[PDB]
Structure formats: C-alpha cells, structure tokens
Amino acid sequence: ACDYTCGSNCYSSSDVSTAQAAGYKLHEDGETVGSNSYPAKYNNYEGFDFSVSSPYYAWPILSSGDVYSGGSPGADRVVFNENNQLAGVITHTGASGNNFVECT
Numbered sequence: 001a002c003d004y005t006c007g008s009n010c011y012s013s014s015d016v017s018t019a020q021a022a023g024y025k026l027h028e029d030g031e032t033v034g035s036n037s038y039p040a041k042y043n044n045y046e047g048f049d050f051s052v053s054s055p056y057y058a059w060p061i062l063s064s065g066d067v068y069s070g071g072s073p074g075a076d077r078v079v080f081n082e083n084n085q086l087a088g089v090i091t092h093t094g095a096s097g098n099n100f101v102e103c104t
C-alpha cells in the first residue's frame, strides 16, 4: 500500500525520507537547483493544517525514485521545516491552477 498517494504516484515513507534529506541538505548549504530554485520557501497559501512550525520549504519528490537534481520537478513535493521535520506531502495533481492539494 502507499503511505502517500499523489495522483497516480505511490510513495512509501522511505521515499519521502530520502527526498527530504536531500532537500534539507541543500537548504543548509544555501544552494538551489532547477528553474524554480528548490528547495523553495513554501508560504502555505492553501492553509494546510501542518502540525510542525514554519518556516516551510518545498522540495520535489520524484515518482521515478531518483532524487531531484534539476530539470522538471514534476507535480509532487515534500514540505519540511527549519528543524528538518516533515510537514507533509503535497501535489499539483488534482488541484486548480497553481494550487496544491495534500497527498492522501
């Protein structure tokens, strides 16, 4: 079963931890990759009910299993905070415009 389901993409907790670790590392080094400069600040316009405190940062999680290194970020993102705590997993899939919805 999927720990997180983003559209047709299935993710396990291990997939999320691996992606989060990569994104947090770049965050601590102040380095960014991709046209959207990930890891990027996530303002939570959607108003998701995250249990951990902000600031939040979004980092792409890929359905291929590989860690994001630039290029197309796809539609899914892992959101983490300054303490390297997981806030949630979100996606543009099934969301209007440039908004996000949570993966179930």
Ligand SMILES: Nc1nc2c(ncn2[C@@H]2O[C@H](CO)[C@@H](OP(=O)(O)O)[C@H]2O)c(=O)[nH]1
Binding pocket: 036, 040, 041, 042, 043, 044, 045, 046, 098, 099, 100
């Ligand atoms: N939907 C959404 N986009 C945000 C938020 N904070 C920052 N953004 C950024 O703003 C852009 C959308 O206006 C997003 O790019 P993306 O659409 O390429 O993912 C994303 O990087 C937020 O809270 N919600």
Ligand SMILES: [Ca+2]
Binding pocket: 010, 011, 012, 015, 065
């Ligand atoms: Ca996987």
